[PDB]
Amino acid sequence: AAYKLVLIRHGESAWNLENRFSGWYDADLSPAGHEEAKRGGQALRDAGYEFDICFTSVQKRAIRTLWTVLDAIDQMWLPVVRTWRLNERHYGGLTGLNKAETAAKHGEAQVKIWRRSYDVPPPPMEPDHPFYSNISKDRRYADLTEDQLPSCESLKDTIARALPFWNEEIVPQIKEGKRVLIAAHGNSLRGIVKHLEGLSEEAIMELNLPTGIPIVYELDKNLKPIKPMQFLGDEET
Amino acid sequence: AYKLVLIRHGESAWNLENRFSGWYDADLSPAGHEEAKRGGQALRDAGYEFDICFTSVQKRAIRTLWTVLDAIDQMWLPVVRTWRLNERHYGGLTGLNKAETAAKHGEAQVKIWRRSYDVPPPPMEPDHPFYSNISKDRRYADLTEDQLPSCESLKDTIARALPFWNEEIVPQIKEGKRVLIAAHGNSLRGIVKHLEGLSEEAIMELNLPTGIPIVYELDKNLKPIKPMQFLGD
Ligand SMILES: O=C(O)COc1cc(Cl)ccc1-c1ccc(C(=O)O)c(NS(=O)(=O)c2ccc(-c3ccccc3)cc2)c1
Ligand SMILES: [Cl-]
Description:
The structure is a homodimer.
Chain A: E1 3-9, H1 14-17, H2 31-46, E2 53-56, H3 60-72, E3 80-82, H4 99-116, H5 132-136, H6 155-175, E4 180-184, H7 186-197, H8 201-206, E5 215-219, E6 230-231
Parallel strand pairs in A: 1-4, 2-3, 2-4
Antiparallel strand pairs in A: 1-5, 5-6
Helix pairs in contact in A: 2-3, 6-7
The structure holds the ligand O=C(O)COc1cc(Cl)ccc1-c1ccc(C(=O)O)c(NS(=O)(=O)c2ccc(-c3ccccc3)cc2)c1 and chloride ion.
């Protein structure tokens, strides 16, 4: 194929352990998620993968996943670009709640609506939210215009602010011949997959990307996948 | 009063900091990683904040930068890596200890190399065990034939570094970005020489400590307004 693209979704965070919604909250990897990242890097290493540029979010679970990979494949000297546009979905008011508090507070029907809807956002994170300032006033977002910093996001929203970065920053790089590695989050990566494969909103809702596993696309010169996405690792995983 | 912070990596594997590690991509030792860790803790306890970091393409410095940024919770910061911040290239001596250098070249020539600002050591030849390792390394495949050193005098190292300073770090400092620089002894020495307008003999005298934030306060023209400062006990 003309081009090769590798994506990796970060692994288990500290907050997955507590069953808490992270979104834009900057949770670090759990030890186990760190190990997933190591296994993924080892898979790239064993397959002799080489990259020229790396993209990731401004969230430390994705950034650390990237570091761990670059270490495994002995390519820590690569340029790395970080952007909020690759951030996890902003879960708004649900940020910091766990599963139980959320089901108790909103009921099964409303939670099903949130999980199954493509353009239904969860409640906005209001200024009295425990993490309002921790997130909304983090200087790493100082450069965002008033309307780019979200209070909550549907999947459509997350994909809408991620795809501009794909089209304007990564695509040019792929067409330049640069081998690209994107280390990010399930939902912004969902956006990229939906675009690459022209999936329906229904299909993309069905799709969950495996964590800590390198996801290889062989693409033609128009960035059209020449075959289904493949994973790297041992025969088991 | 602009604030600029420099840090020099610590000990590398297999004693290579005492074997002219140079352009060989030696990793930090556990001890050297701990050194970076303390440097980061000190930067945190003092609440330092940066807006952009520069480093070399050598992993001991890259890992020092990673470790600092971890400790200070600023892993989201933009990072620029450039071979111009690379350690001095010690040519054929790369990998040799003091004794082996003396055996192979003589005390007289070794002392001259120590004290000389513009005398390079012998080139690293194709029979050197690191020759293809370094010179055929993908990370340098964008350098011109005249850019990829086979050896370097201190002058060569500083000459190759200062263009990156001028063309890339200074503009960030002027726009007010708080710059952090993680690199190596001799590339940091070039920067210090340019800051403090030092002499050849002076910079060859200067010996920057490792694992310890070095702090400058600059003015609208980027001249230091006090001696450098060190963060710790
Ligand atoms: O895209 C994503 O990020 C993931 O999807 C979501 C998106 C948003 Cl914004 C918010 C939440 C989810 C989400 C969150 C939690 C769960 C979960 O495990 O609790 C889940 N799974 S569920 O099948 O739909 C489900 C099934 C049964 C109940 C139930 C409630 C009350 C009593 C008894 C049962 C609740 C939820 C989905
Ligand atoms: Cl980085």
